Every structure is written in structure tokens, then in C-alpha cells.
Ligand binder design. Sequence first.
Ligand code: NA
Lengths: 16, 16
Amino acid sequence: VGAXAXVXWXWXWXWX
Amino acid sequence: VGAXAXVXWXFXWXWX
Ligand code: NA
């Protein structure tokens, strides 16, 4: 849990 | 739904 890649908040593919 | 900022897959903060 923290910063980098995976899932959650920020840039890439999903919803916003 | 798609690419850009928000929740889902990618970079930033959350789970690896
Ligand atoms: Na995200």
C-alpha cells in the first residue's frame, strides 16, 4: 500500500 | 470510463 503501480488513485485506466 | 485520471489501474497511490 503506497505509491507506484497497481490499483487506486492516479493515472491509467478506469473511472473519472 | 477509460484512460486518464481517476480510480482504477495505473500509477499513483493505492494497492500493489
Ligand atoms: Na487510478
